[PDB]
Write a protein that binds this ligand. Structure first.
Ligand SMILES: N[C@@H]1COc2cc(C(=O)N3C[C@@H](c4ccccc4)C[C@H]3C(=O)Nc3cccc(Cl)c3)ccc21
Ligand SMILES: *SC[C@H](NC(=O)CC[C@H](N)C(=O)O)C(=O)NCC(=O)O
Length: 237
């Protein structure tokens, strides 16, 4: 996250860190807890070799530097990538992770609400993006979970900024005309959440953008509302 600030405990209890343990262990992507046994993330997080028994999913963690060998983590039972996803493209950048064991809910480990049927994106005026990604374009993973307030952008405006790509109805963009605040490398797969009727809703999954926090180059997010039929089908309700 560029231009954000430190989060506090319990502010974003659905945020998870997707890490890979080879000989070293590294954070690679964000994700969002959506139920006891389900995480929603970006399909591009899985573009590498599909190695078995390497992913560790950390929840209930605010500071990655607080993770030790004794810190509990979830493991992957199944990865469900959207059927129309292609590696060389940004479309359908969404994946479900089924965990090997259900997590119990706590103040620091609980699900984001999925968007409600029949809600236009213009109802969302208070939106935030979170993660442990770079705080500048040539930066590094951040220890304390960062947060930044960000306005949603119209699909017409977002398309104007990315004329070499197709910004579809299944995408939502967010950012500032003057840049300065944005998600960045290592934030992809995490949440874009907007607070409505006292509850946070998962509006986007951090996906892509040209650089980070550049002028007139907003972040592009997978629009979760446009994948609700798919999410419900794959989670068997
Ligand atoms: N500023 C916009 C809004 O939020 C963004 C998020 C990303 C982003 O994090 N990634 C773009 C993703 C990607 C998608 C499609 C095609 C190509 C790349 C791969 C992933 C990424 O670089 N991860 C990464 C890189 C180095 C180290 C580590 Cl640990 C993780 C990039 C740009 C923006
Ligand atoms: S919609 C998903 C989260 N809600 C619940 O899990 C229900 C909580 C109580 N049992 C209740 O109110 O009935 C949720 O609200 N997450 C987003 C948030 O703002 O916390």
């Amino acid at each position: 996250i560029v231009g954000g600030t430190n989060s506090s405990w319990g502010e974003w209890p659905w945020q998870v860190s997707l890490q890979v343990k080879l000989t070293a262990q590294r954070h690679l992507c964000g994700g969002s807890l959506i139920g006891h046994q389900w995480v929603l993330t970006a399909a591009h997080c899985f573009d590498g070799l599909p190695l078995q028994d390497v992913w560790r999913i950390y929840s209930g963690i605010l500071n990655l530097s607080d993770i030790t060998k004794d810190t509990p983590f979830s493991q992957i039972k199944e990865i469900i990538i959207h059927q129309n996803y292609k590696v060389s493209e940004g479309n359908h950048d969404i994946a479900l992770i089924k965990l090997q064991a259900p997590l119990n809910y706590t103040e620091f480990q609980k699900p984001i609400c999925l968007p409600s049927k029949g809600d236009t994106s213009t109802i969302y005026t208070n939106c935030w993006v979170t993660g442990w990604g770079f705080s500048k374009e040539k930066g590094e993973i951040q220890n304390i979970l960062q947060k930044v307030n960000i306005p949603l952008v119209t699909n017409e405006e977002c398309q104007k900024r990315y004329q070499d790509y197709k910004i579809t109805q299944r995408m939502v963009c967010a950012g500032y005309k003057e840049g300065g605040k944005d998600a960045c490398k290592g934030d992809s797969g995490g949440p874009l959440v907007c607070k409505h009727n006292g509850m946070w809703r998962l509006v986007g999954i951090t996906s892509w953008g040209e650089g980070c926090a550049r002028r007139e180059q907003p972040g592009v997010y997978t629009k979760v509302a446009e994948y609700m039929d798919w999410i419900l089908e794959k989670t068997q309700s």
